[PDB]
């Protein structure tokens, strides 16, 4: 193939497989940055000639994980406050404005906040 | 006029009517400011520049309060430092805690002034929270995070006054005042991206540069901008091998701390479509070849077709440096050929301005003097595209005085008001002898501006003859203290090519069906004849139509990868500076010509830059004075104006169509810049669309 | 005693002075300096006060993380302290302490910037090792080993 | 001053023959409105036509063989920089800073 | 006053909806400019904006685009004017407009009770629109009727010195068309 | 020594009083990814980690095409 394995996409096309070592991450096939080197090209190198690719570090791609979270919906307020759900062990407190009819993600965490009144259109 | 005053014991002598802050800045006292910029109208709303005047209880906005005589101005009283910390404690009340994720991080004035002039602690633990605003989308070039705006109106004042784009303003009242465009529409100005530099905070940041570097990483290199002929002084920031961003730098004679949106956001074309290895055409495809094999093939190919005396054609592109021009001009004459010209679209074989007299093809009035001009006549020029920054200079004059601008050519949507006259030569003919021509002669320093696109018309010689006929018969247009005739160029290597006479004046030679064509960065040869039985070599840094036609391709270096000489439209000689290395095995542009000569039996005398830089003294002795203009002496200029006047010229009545039909695709780097592709989709070829279809 | 620094003026402790200038005297003085340290250490355990451990000046000391993540000015100062640094007013100094080896001092030259312009380090061992020739003159090879040990030559300081 | 002081500095010969230094005063940055980094004169060396920076194959670092890439000198007078450059026998070239032209600015000008 | 300063095109409002003055409003508009000098005719945006507001019912985007066209101005200088002033309605707004002052000099005469009395009858809160489009309640700052404090304001009328039992007369009548006499 | 699981590596060094099997559920780490068997230090084997550059090259060479004159 090498078509998805070498170009970054917002969402993949086929279901990722944990055993496929050529995937960028065990839970995602294509890379998630335009300048991120594909993992297929990275391991096609002389230094991997006598290695065991299954034991090299393969952390789970964080882009796929963060979009598996539900959208927080705020009730009768257009401003959400996020702090990383840890206070002094999270990110700095940032206020998110939800006037626009979309889910605005937090700058640090990546959690997506919206209004309850906008949920029906958003969930379409 | 000057009023003598003391600021904190330092005597100050400034022009009368100046503000206190300019007086203080001259005495060396530093007065913190957010809303005051030295090229914008004065608003006094940020309230950070407050000082104390001896005969008053009320603190003075030193950016607005005009200077007095004998006045005593205090800046370091404990009363003032209390005020500075109070104001600082107010701006940061609603400011987001965004510094880690904010692209203004290491270069934000709200950080450095708060650190220097504010308190070290914050007293805002309120439970309701801060104010939040929605980010407005105003195009693909400006990334807005309006949470961070400190309501200083530099964006509004610049776009309204300098840029002439009245769609940006303050909508709302009080705590809900929201800088923006009210409705959703993209900002349409060729100078709109200069707002990114003015916005002191992270509210308006570059979209192409977003999240890519921190200001302490970059290495700043002072060079020139070659996307248009003004040669605006820029600053190129490189993080290692890549060029990350381009910014303006102060030069009050050329650009005045602005650069057009083409200049700054075309930096990402340098990483795409680059020529990195020599390529040799085999069959219908290219293969990689070494410099030994590629230089030999050109040497071998030249002797196979055996071009005669003047059957060798050299074509010079828009971006080409001056050192390569002379290296190529010497090389072709070393083979005894003078079929050397450019890839433009000129009609008459001797270009209407010619190359004999410098006064006929430069901007003789100098850009710094356009401020004091009384009347300006535009002939077939669209400065909004050809020289974007120069257009803003004319507007600033037309807003502060009674300058009247006259335009002859194709009508265009201009920033300042025009007095349209017509769209052909005959229209200009009556206008010169009519009411408008009378206006110029009565004026002290009138201006006549001829565009670069005049030549590319069928009536190239008629207009130059017509206008010169007016100039050759006046005393106000050309004085000892004024030279009122100007030509506006748009390709960055015209004045360089004409100063060294890289132009053929023999009509029969220009018609010779040349067999060996050596393309030096020429990428617009669609109309130019290239016979199927011609051996073409292209030496450039980008793969485009010029490289597609070639049979051997020799990679070269961009202006950010070499030291070179450029002469801008007004005759000023400017030398770039090397910021990075050329990619791959790509060599220097004039070094290839020297190395190619040794294979072709025309070994050039030069061995290095300094040896070649001695050659620039030979061709024209003014090409060794950097950033210095050698104005044409008044007497000799009047000789050149006469030879342009020729009885027996027929005006064909061709519309003086502007040559720039796409503002963003003009050079090789622009056509390969991914960001410029977004602009054409969002703004359009003429920056006229008001809605962004491309929005996702 | 000559220039007391950092609470050394608050505690009470004695010093020991030799009389023969030989290795045995320096052995005894060090063993006394052990017991005088154990006398100061107890007092600092009993006289320890409460309060801040650093200057209450966020323009030279990073703000606490909790305040950093909640207060805007703390975030600005935390940002500029870890990237730009803090500026030191121009001038120069020569600060000496009673290091365990001897007198250690630094000659720091400031330029108003965030980086020292000059920093000369006066290591006690470096000045001692020069006097080795003047002392070892007239001694045997087993006696040289004693003189090096009685000088306390850690050569990181000598070869700074 | 007049002496060939470079013969005692032990510097490699290539700084005299093969490298070009530049005496310049740093320009004001467009992004920020401060005017303090533009009051001291500095000397920097030109980059090399090849081998200034190249990508390390293994980890993607920025390798370099230019031993003057991170050397910037500071001065307080222009003459001291030129004198020092002359003393070392450096092949320098001076970059004259641009001078902003004065223009009086008045609050009332928005209507007059 | 509802303080939102970014306009979003609705099915009811967009620049694609035409707006043209009536034959009468041209005569007033032609003579409204008569109060301003020739070189400063742009000062008449505030009259024309409210004059055009009444023809349509509120301050639509088409009005602002039309008003800018009339006086030779970029549409933004009208947007700045429109959203700075609190009497321009950038929404359908319905038929009537209840303005209830809640400032301190009014709040001394139990101005809270008038607010509760209105909210009871119409099943709406301040800043809301009735399901019928006949009414749209709206809080307001001082209107000048402070010496006669407990005052309601409907459209442009006055009803001072009120009580929750004074609200029964008006809220019933306006639906039936029987409008009480203002003053 | 690399065979000791990270949770217990801290307890063994007298760094904590609560063993990682007596942790409060409001003190356990929350992992949104499957956790596999502990992998010891893999040096002197074939599983030793190999560094590589995670960034693409910074210049993209021209994709050559040939066009033929009229
Ligand atoms: S604009 Fe300045 S103060 Fe505000 S978040 Fe960005 S860096 Fe911090
Ligand atoms: S957006 Fe930037 S330039 Fe415009 S007012 Fe706000 S801080 Fe000033
Ligand atoms: S600088 Fe004077 S109030 Fe802003
Ligand atoms: S306080 Fe209510 S009308 Fe004045
Ligand atoms: K900015
Ligand atoms: Zn968050």
mmCIF file with all atom_site columns, N, CA, C and O in Angstrom, chain B residues 16-18 22 38 40 42 64 107 109 112 219 222 241 250 252 371 393 577 581 610 627, chain D residues 22 27 29 31-33 44 47-48 52-53 62 91 95 98 100-102 104-105 107 110:
data_model
loop_
_atom_site.group_PDB
_atom_site.id
_atom_site.type_symbol
_atom_site.label_atom_id
_atom_site.label_alt_id
_atom_site.label_comp_id
_atom_site.label_asym_id
_atom_site.label_entity_id
_atom_site.label_seq_id
_atom_site.pdbx_PDB_ins_code
_atom_site.Cartn_x
_atom_site.Cartn_y
_atom_site.Cartn_z
_atom_site.occupancy
_atom_site.B_iso_or_equiv
_atom_site.pdbx_formal_charge
_atom_site.auth_seq_id
_atom_site.auth_comp_id
_atom_site.auth_asym_id
_atom_site.auth_atom_id
_atom_site.pdbx_PDB_model_num
ATOM 1   N N  . UNK B 1 16  ? 8.750  71.941 17.248 1.00 0.00 ? 16  UNK B N  1
ATOM 2   C CA . UNK B 1 16  ? 7.533  72.340 17.935 1.00 0.00 ? 16  UNK B CA 1
ATOM 3   C C  . UNK B 1 16  ? 6.345  71.546 17.412 1.00 0.00 ? 16  UNK B C  1
ATOM 4   O O  . UNK B 1 16  ? 6.314  71.121 16.255 1.00 0.00 ? 16  UNK B O  1
ATOM 5   N N  . UNK B 1 17  ? 5.359  71.345 18.282 1.00 0.00 ? 17  UNK B N  1
ATOM 6   C CA . UNK B 1 17  ? 4.212  70.532 17.954 1.00 0.00 ? 17  UNK B CA 1
ATOM 7   C C  . UNK B 1 17  ? 4.408  69.048 18.154 1.00 0.00 ? 17  UNK B C  1
ATOM 8   O O  . UNK B 1 17  ? 3.449  68.285 17.989 1.00 0.00 ? 17  UNK B O  1
ATOM 9   N N  . UNK B 1 18  ? 5.614  68.610 18.503 1.00 0.00 ? 18  UNK B N  1
ATOM 10  C CA . UNK B 1 18  ? 5.854  67.207 18.781 1.00 0.00 ? 18  UNK B CA 1
ATOM 11  C C  . UNK B 1 18  ? 5.220  66.816 20.108 1.00 0.00 ? 18  UNK B C  1
ATOM 12  O O  . UNK B 1 18  ? 4.857  67.661 20.928 1.00 0.00 ? 18  UNK B O  1
ATOM 13  N N  . UNK B 1 22  ? 8.100  61.629 22.055 1.00 0.00 ? 22  UNK B N  1
ATOM 14  C CA . UNK B 1 22  ? 9.211  61.799 21.126 1.00 0.00 ? 22  UNK B CA 1
ATOM 15  C C  . UNK B 1 22  ? 10.318 62.629 21.754 1.00 0.00 ? 22  UNK B C  1
ATOM 16  O O  . UNK B 1 22  ? 11.505 62.366 21.534 1.00 0.00 ? 22  UNK B O  1
ATOM 17  N N  . UNK B 1 38  ? 5.085  54.816 15.878 1.00 0.00 ? 38  UNK B N  1
ATOM 18  C CA . UNK B 1 38  ? 5.639  56.018 15.273 1.00 0.00 ? 38  UNK B CA 1
ATOM 19  C C  . UNK B 1 38  ? 5.303  56.157 13.796 1.00 0.00 ? 38  UNK B C  1
ATOM 20  O O  . UNK B 1 38  ? 5.825  57.063 13.141 1.00 0.00 ? 38  UNK B O  1
ATOM 21  N N  . UNK B 1 40  ? 1.769  55.595 12.954 1.00 0.00 ? 40  UNK B N  1
ATOM 22  C CA . UNK B 1 40  ? 0.319  55.556 13.016 1.00 0.00 ? 40  UNK B CA 1
ATOM 23  C C  . UNK B 1 40  ? -0.210 56.830 13.651 1.00 0.00 ? 40  UNK B C  1
ATOM 24  O O  . UNK B 1 40  ? 0.510  57.545 14.351 1.00 0.00 ? 40  UNK B O  1
ATOM 25  N N  . UNK B 1 42  ? -2.220 59.015 16.354 1.00 0.00 ? 42  UNK B N  1
ATOM 26  C CA . UNK B 1 42  ? -2.130 58.913 17.803 1.00 0.00 ? 42  UNK B CA 1
ATOM 27  C C  . UNK B 1 42  ? -3.514 58.664 18.380 1.00 0.00 ? 42  UNK B C  1
ATOM 28  O O  . UNK B 1 42  ? -4.431 59.471 18.202 1.00 0.00 ? 42  UNK B O  1
ATOM 29  N N  . UNK B 1 64  ? 0.177  61.831 23.373 1.00 0.00 ? 64  UNK B N  1
ATOM 30  C CA . UNK B 1 64  ? -0.784 62.751 22.789 1.00 0.00 ? 64  UNK B CA 1
ATOM 31  C C  . UNK B 1 64  ? -0.522 64.201 23.151 1.00 0.00 ? 64  UNK B C  1
ATOM 32  O O  . UNK B 1 64  ? -0.735 65.082 22.317 1.00 0.00 ? 64  UNK B O  1
ATOM 33  N N  . UNK B 1 107 ? 8.644  37.336 22.557 1.00 0.00 ? 107 UNK B N  1
ATOM 34  C CA . UNK B 1 107 ? 8.806  38.621 21.891 1.00 0.00 ? 107 UNK B CA 1
ATOM 35  C C  . UNK B 1 107 ? 7.570  39.485 22.066 1.00 0.00 ? 107 UNK B C  1
ATOM 36  O O  . UNK B 1 107 ? 7.217  40.278 21.189 1.00 0.00 ? 107 UNK B O  1
ATOM 37  N N  . UNK B 1 109 ? 5.388  42.391 23.885 1.00 0.00 ? 109 UNK B N  1
ATOM 38  C CA . UNK B 1 109 ? 5.594  43.606 24.665 1.00 0.00 ? 109 UNK B CA 1
ATOM 39  C C  . UNK B 1 109 ? 4.801  43.595 25.961 1.00 0.00 ? 109 UNK B C  1
ATOM 40  O O  . UNK B 1 109 ? 5.207  44.233 26.934 1.00 0.00 ? 109 UNK B O  1
ATOM 41  N N  . UNK B 1 112 ? 7.316  41.935 28.453 1.00 0.00 ? 112 UNK B N  1
ATOM 42  C CA . UNK B 1 112 ? 8.522  42.642 28.853 1.00 0.00 ? 112 UNK B CA 1
ATOM 43  C C  . UNK B 1 112 ? 8.202  43.916 29.618 1.00 0.00 ? 112 UNK B C  1
ATOM 44  O O  . UNK B 1 112 ? 8.924  44.283 30.551 1.00 0.00 ? 112 UNK B O  1
ATOM 45  N N  . UNK B 1 219 ? 18.022 32.793 14.005 1.00 0.00 ? 219 UNK B N  1
ATOM 46  C CA . UNK B 1 219 ? 19.157 33.655 13.724 1.00 0.00 ? 219 UNK B CA 1
ATOM 47  C C  . UNK B 1 219 ? 18.730 34.707 12.712 1.00 0.00 ? 219 UNK B C  1
ATOM 48  O O  . UNK B 1 219 ? 18.251 34.369 11.626 1.00 0.00 ? 219 UNK B O  1
ATOM 49  N N  . UNK B 1 222 ? 20.077 40.178 7.948  1.00 0.00 ? 222 UNK B N  1
ATOM 50  C CA . UNK B 1 222 ? 19.527 41.351 7.285  1.00 0.00 ? 222 UNK B CA 1
ATOM 51  C C  . UNK B 1 222 ? 19.851 41.291 5.798  1.00 0.00 ? 222 UNK B C  1
ATOM 52  O O  . UNK B 1 222 ? 21.022 41.337 5.409  1.00 0.00 ? 222 UNK B O  1
ATOM 53  N N  . UNK B 1 241 ? 18.882 25.146 9.094  1.00 0.00 ? 241 UNK B N  1
ATOM 54  C CA . UNK B 1 241 ? 18.920 25.116 7.640  1.00 0.00 ? 241 UNK B CA 1
ATOM 55  C C  . UNK B 1 241 ? 17.672 25.724 7.012  1.00 0.00 ? 241 UNK B C  1
ATOM 56  O O  . UNK B 1 241 ? 17.732 26.176 5.860  1.00 0.00 ? 241 UNK B O  1
ATOM 57  N N  . UNK B 1 250 ? 13.573 48.501 9.437  1.00 0.00 ? 250 UNK B N  1
ATOM 58  C CA . UNK B 1 250 ? 13.443 49.932 9.206  1.00 0.00 ? 250 UNK B CA 1
ATOM 59  C C  . UNK B 1 250 ? 14.331 50.400 8.066  1.00 0.00 ? 250 UNK B C  1
ATOM 60  O O  . UNK B 1 250 ? 15.546 50.187 8.078  1.00 0.00 ? 250 UNK B O  1
ATOM 61  N N  . UNK B 1 252 ? 13.688 54.038 5.919  1.00 0.00 ? 252 UNK B N  1
ATOM 62  C CA . UNK B 1 252 ? 12.721 55.086 5.622  1.00 0.00 ? 252 UNK B CA 1
ATOM 63  C C  . UNK B 1 252 ? 12.738 55.523 4.169  1.00 0.00 ? 252 UNK B C  1
ATOM 64  O O  . UNK B 1 252 ? 11.858 56.287 3.764  1.00 0.00 ? 252 UNK B O  1
ATOM 65  N N  . UNK B 1 371 ? 7.238  61.878 -0.955 1.00 0.00 ? 371 UNK B N  1
ATOM 66  C CA . UNK B 1 371 ? 6.466  62.562 0.074  1.00 0.00 ? 371 UNK B CA 1
ATOM 67  C C  . UNK B 1 371 ? 6.212  64.017 -0.293 1.00 0.00 ? 371 UNK B C  1
ATOM 68  O O  . UNK B 1 371 ? 5.118  64.542 -0.062 1.00 0.00 ? 371 UNK B O  1
ATOM 69  N N  . UNK B 1 393 ? 2.931  54.449 0.231  1.00 0.00 ? 393 UNK B N  1
ATOM 70  C CA . UNK B 1 393 ? 3.627  55.718 0.412  1.00 0.00 ? 393 UNK B CA 1
ATOM 71  C C  . UNK B 1 393 ? 2.858  56.857 -0.236 1.00 0.00 ? 393 UNK B C  1
ATOM 72  O O  . UNK B 1 393 ? 2.754  57.947 0.332  1.00 0.00 ? 393 UNK B O  1
ATOM 73  N N  . UNK B 1 577 ? 22.632 39.014 1.828  1.00 0.00 ? 577 UNK B N  1
ATOM 74  C CA . UNK B 1 577 ? 23.523 38.324 2.745  1.00 0.00 ? 577 UNK B CA 1
ATOM 75  C C  . UNK B 1 577 ? 23.089 36.872 2.833  1.00 0.00 ? 577 UNK B C  1
ATOM 76  O O  . UNK B 1 577 ? 21.896 36.572 2.760  1.00 0.00 ? 577 UNK B O  1
ATOM 77  N N  . UNK B 1 581 ? 22.477 27.479 3.553  1.00 0.00 ? 581 UNK B N  1
ATOM 78  C CA . UNK B 1 581 ? 23.178 26.852 2.446  1.00 0.00 ? 581 UNK B CA 1
ATOM 79  C C  . UNK B 1 581 ? 22.190 26.342 1.400  1.00 0.00 ? 581 UNK B C  1
ATOM 80  O O  . UNK B 1 581 ? 21.061 25.972 1.730  1.00 0.00 ? 581 UNK B O  1
ATOM 81  N N  . UNK B 1 610 ? 35.353 38.381 -4.777 1.00 0.00 ? 610 UNK B N  1
ATOM 82  C CA . UNK B 1 610 ? 36.061 39.653 -4.849 1.00 0.00 ? 610 UNK B CA 1
ATOM 83  C C  . UNK B 1 610 ? 36.604 39.914 -6.250 1.00 0.00 ? 610 UNK B C  1
ATOM 84  O O  . UNK B 1 610 ? 36.546 41.047 -6.740 1.00 0.00 ? 610 UNK B O  1
ATOM 85  N N  . UNK B 1 627 ? 23.844 50.491 -1.079 1.00 0.00 ? 627 UNK B N  1
ATOM 86  C CA . UNK B 1 627 ? 22.848 51.361 -0.458 1.00 0.00 ? 627 UNK B CA 1
ATOM 87  C C  . UNK B 1 627 ? 23.107 52.834 -0.753 1.00 0.00 ? 627 UNK B C  1
ATOM 88  O O  . UNK B 1 627 ? 22.732 53.708 0.030  1.00 0.00 ? 627 UNK B O  1
ATOM 89  N N  . UNK D 2 22  ? 31.905 40.710 9.867  1.00 0.00 ? 22  UNK D N  1
ATOM 90  C CA . UNK D 2 22  ? 31.036 41.850 9.620  1.00 0.00 ? 22  UNK D CA 1
ATOM 91  C C  . UNK D 2 22  ? 30.898 42.673 10.889 1.00 0.00 ? 22  UNK D C  1
ATOM 92  O O  . UNK D 2 22  ? 30.606 42.127 11.955 1.00 0.00 ? 22  UNK D O  1
ATOM 93  N N  . UNK D 2 27  ? 19.639 45.639 14.193 1.00 0.00 ? 27  UNK D N  1
ATOM 94  C CA . UNK D 2 27  ? 18.496 46.466 13.841 1.00 0.00 ? 27  UNK D CA 1
ATOM 95  C C  . UNK D 2 27  ? 17.334 46.234 14.802 1.00 0.00 ? 27  UNK D C  1
ATOM 96  O O  . UNK D 2 27  ? 17.244 45.205 15.477 1.00 0.00 ? 27  UNK D O  1
ATOM 97  N N  . UNK D 2 29  ? 13.783 45.169 15.975 1.00 0.00 ? 29  UNK D N  1
ATOM 98  C CA . UNK D 2 29  ? 12.881 44.110 15.548 1.00 0.00 ? 29  UNK D CA 1
ATOM 99  C C  . UNK D 2 29  ? 11.487 44.667 15.306 1.00 0.00 ? 29  UNK D C  1
ATOM 100 O O  . UNK D 2 29  ? 11.012 45.532 16.044 1.00 0.00 ? 29  UNK D O  1
ATOM 101 N N  . UNK D 2 31  ? 8.616  43.046 15.547 1.00 0.00 ? 31  UNK D N  1
ATOM 102 C CA . UNK D 2 31  ? 7.611  42.531 16.472 1.00 0.00 ? 31  UNK D CA 1
ATOM 103 C C  . UNK D 2 31  ? 7.510  43.379 17.736 1.00 0.00 ? 31  UNK D C  1
ATOM 104 O O  . UNK D 2 31  ? 6.405  43.687 18.195 1.00 0.00 ? 31  UNK D O  1
ATOM 105 N N  . UNK D 2 32  ? 8.642  43.771 18.309 1.00 0.00 ? 32  UNK D N  1
ATOM 106 C CA . UNK D 2 32  ? 8.666  44.482 19.578 1.00 0.00 ? 32  UNK D CA 1
ATOM 107 C C  . UNK D 2 32  ? 9.116  45.920 19.373 1.00 0.00 ? 32  UNK D C  1
ATOM 108 O O  . UNK D 2 32  ? 9.876  46.224 18.452 1.00 0.00 ? 32  UNK D O  1
ATOM 109 N N  . UNK D 2 33  ? 8.654  46.803 20.255 1.00 0.00 ? 33  UNK D N  1
ATOM 110 C CA . UNK D 2 33  ? 8.934  48.227 20.146 1.00 0.00 ? 33  UNK D CA 1
ATOM 111 C C  . UNK D 2 33  ? 10.066 48.689 21.055 1.00 0.00 ? 33  UNK D C  1
ATOM 112 O O  . UNK D 2 33  ? 10.238 49.894 21.242 1.00 0.00 ? 33  UNK D O  1
ATOM 113 N N  . UNK D 2 44  ? 30.111 39.768 13.711 1.00 0.00 ? 44  UNK D N  1
ATOM 114 C CA . UNK D 2 44  ? 29.764 38.387 13.426 1.00 0.00 ? 44  UNK D CA 1
ATOM 115 C C  . UNK D 2 44  ? 30.457 37.972 12.141 1.00 0.00 ? 44  UNK D C  1
ATOM 116 O O  . UNK D 2 44  ? 30.822 38.806 11.313 1.00 0.00 ? 44  UNK D O  1
ATOM 117 N N  . UNK D 2 47  ? 28.706 33.043 7.119  1.00 0.00 ? 47  UNK D N  1
ATOM 118 C CA . UNK D 2 47  ? 28.580 31.591 7.099  1.00 0.00 ? 47  UNK D CA 1
ATOM 119 C C  . UNK D 2 47  ? 29.424 31.028 5.969  1.00 0.00 ? 47  UNK D C  1
ATOM 120 O O  . UNK D 2 47  ? 29.911 31.770 5.112  1.00 0.00 ? 47  UNK D O  1
ATOM 121 N N  . UNK D 2 48  ? 29.605 29.715 5.966  1.00 0.00 ? 48  UNK D N  1
ATOM 122 C CA . UNK D 2 48  ? 30.399 29.044 4.952  1.00 0.00 ? 48  UNK D CA 1
ATOM 123 C C  . UNK D 2 48  ? 29.526 28.596 3.788  1.00 0.00 ? 48  UNK D C  1
ATOM 124 O O  . UNK D 2 48  ? 28.371 28.203 3.962  1.00 0.00 ? 48  UNK D O  1
ATOM 125 N N  . UNK D 2 52  ? 28.254 24.776 6.578  1.00 0.00 ? 52  UNK D N  1
ATOM 126 C CA . UNK D 2 52  ? 27.779 25.609 7.677  1.00 0.00 ? 52  UNK D CA 1
ATOM 127 C C  . UNK D 2 52  ? 26.778 24.853 8.542  1.00 0.00 ? 52  UNK D C  1
ATOM 128 O O  . UNK D 2 52  ? 26.857 24.894 9.773  1.00 0.00 ? 52  UNK D O  1
ATOM 129 N N  . UNK D 2 53  ? 25.829 24.157 7.916  1.00 0.00 ? 53  UNK D N  1
ATOM 130 C CA . UNK D 2 53  ? 24.883 23.294 8.610  1.00 0.00 ? 53  UNK D CA 1
ATOM 131 C C  . UNK D 2 53  ? 24.502 22.151 7.688  1.00 0.00 ? 53  UNK D C  1
ATOM 132 O O  . UNK D 2 53  ? 24.253 22.367 6.502  1.00 0.00 ? 53  UNK D O  1
ATOM 133 N N  . UNK D 2 62  ? 21.808 19.239 13.823 1.00 0.00 ? 62  UNK D N  1
ATOM 134 C CA . UNK D 2 62  ? 22.338 20.257 12.925 1.00 0.00 ? 62  UNK D CA 1
ATOM 135 C C  . UNK D 2 62  ? 23.846 20.259 13.105 1.00 0.00 ? 62  UNK D C  1
ATOM 136 O O  . UNK D 2 62  ? 24.372 20.995 13.940 1.00 0.00 ? 62  UNK D O  1
ATOM 137 N N  . UNK D 2 91  ? 39.411 40.587 7.672  1.00 0.00 ? 91  UNK D N  1
ATOM 138 C CA . UNK D 2 91  ? 38.848 41.089 6.420  1.00 0.00 ? 91  UNK D CA 1
ATOM 139 C C  . UNK D 2 91  ? 37.371 41.361 6.654  1.00 0.00 ? 91  UNK D C  1
ATOM 140 O O  . UNK D 2 91  ? 36.510 40.550 6.325  1.00 0.00 ? 91  UNK D O  1
ATOM 141 N N  . UNK D 2 95  ? 28.558 47.554 8.092  1.00 0.00 ? 95  UNK D N  1
ATOM 142 C CA . UNK D 2 95  ? 27.173 47.744 7.683  1.00 0.00 ? 95  UNK D CA 1
ATOM 143 C C  . UNK D 2 95  ? 26.621 48.946 8.440  1.00 0.00 ? 95  UNK D C  1
ATOM 144 O O  . UNK D 2 95  ? 26.309 48.852 9.629  1.00 0.00 ? 95  UNK D O  1
ATOM 145 N N  . UNK D 2 98  ? 20.667 52.022 9.408  1.00 0.00 ? 98  UNK D N  1
ATOM 146 C CA . UNK D 2 98  ? 19.733 53.024 8.922  1.00 0.00 ? 98  UNK D CA 1
ATOM 147 C C  . UNK D 2 98  ? 19.298 53.930 10.065 1.00 0.00 ? 98  UNK D C  1
ATOM 148 O O  . UNK D 2 98  ? 19.233 53.517 11.224 1.00 0.00 ? 98  UNK D O  1
ATOM 149 N N  . UNK D 2 100 ? 16.249 56.392 11.333 1.00 0.00 ? 100 UNK D N  1
ATOM 150 C CA . UNK D 2 100 ? 14.860 56.781 11.139 1.00 0.00 ? 100 UNK D CA 1
ATOM 151 C C  . UNK D 2 100 ? 14.741 58.294 11.044 1.00 0.00 ? 100 UNK D C  1
ATOM 152 O O  . UNK D 2 100 ? 15.362 59.031 11.814 1.00 0.00 ? 100 UNK D O  1
ATOM 153 N N  . UNK D 2 101 ? 13.937 58.757 10.093 1.00 0.00 ? 101 UNK D N  1
ATOM 154 C CA . UNK D 2 101 ? 13.754 60.181 9.865  1.00 0.00 ? 101 UNK D CA 1
ATOM 155 C C  . UNK D 2 101 ? 12.674 60.718 10.792 1.00 0.00 ? 101 UNK D C  1
ATOM 156 O O  . UNK D 2 101 ? 11.614 60.104 10.944 1.00 0.00 ? 101 UNK D O  1
ATOM 157 N N  . UNK D 2 102 ? 12.955 61.857 11.418 1.00 0.00 ? 102 UNK D N  1
ATOM 158 C CA . UNK D 2 102 ? 12.048 62.414 12.408 1.00 0.00 ? 102 UNK D CA 1
ATOM 159 C C  . UNK D 2 102 ? 10.782 62.930 11.746 1.00 0.00 ? 102 UNK D C  1
ATOM 160 O O  . UNK D 2 102 ? 10.834 63.556 10.684 1.00 0.00 ? 102 UNK D O  1
ATOM 161 N N  . UNK D 2 104 ? 7.209  64.791 13.388 1.00 0.00 ? 104 UNK D N  1
ATOM 162 C CA . UNK D 2 104 ? 6.424  65.189 14.546 1.00 0.00 ? 104 UNK D CA 1
ATOM 163 C C  . UNK D 2 104 ? 5.018  64.617 14.453 1.00 0.00 ? 104 UNK D C  1
ATOM 164 O O  . UNK D 2 104 ? 4.426  64.552 13.372 1.00 0.00 ? 104 UNK D O  1
ATOM 165 N N  . UNK D 2 105 ? 4.488  64.190 15.597 1.00 0.00 ? 105 UNK D N  1
ATOM 166 C CA . UNK D 2 105 ? 3.203  63.507 15.666 1.00 0.00 ? 105 UNK D CA 1
ATOM 167 C C  . UNK D 2 105 ? 2.313  64.244 16.650 1.00 0.00 ? 105 UNK D C  1
ATOM 168 O O  . UNK D 2 105 ? 2.691  64.437 17.809 1.00 0.00 ? 105 UNK D O  1
ATOM 169 N N  . UNK D 2 107 ? -1.685 64.875 18.335 1.00 0.00 ? 107 UNK D N  1
ATOM 170 C CA . UNK D 2 107 ? -2.992 64.283 18.590 1.00 0.00 ? 107 UNK D CA 1
ATOM 171 C C  . UNK D 2 107 ? -4.070 64.934 17.737 1.00 0.00 ? 107 UNK D C  1
ATOM 172 O O  . UNK D 2 107 ? -4.965 64.252 17.228 1.00 0.00 ? 107 UNK D O  1
ATOM 173 N N  . UNK D 2 110 ? -5.609 64.214 13.621 1.00 0.00 ? 110 UNK D N  1
ATOM 174 C CA . UNK D 2 110 ? -6.642 63.326 13.102 1.00 0.00 ? 110 UNK D CA 1
ATOM 175 C C  . UNK D 2 110 ? -7.791 64.092 12.463 1.00 0.00 ? 110 UNK D C  1
ATOM 176 O O  . UNK D 2 110 ? -8.501 63.536 11.618 1.00 0.00 ? 110 UNK D O  1
#
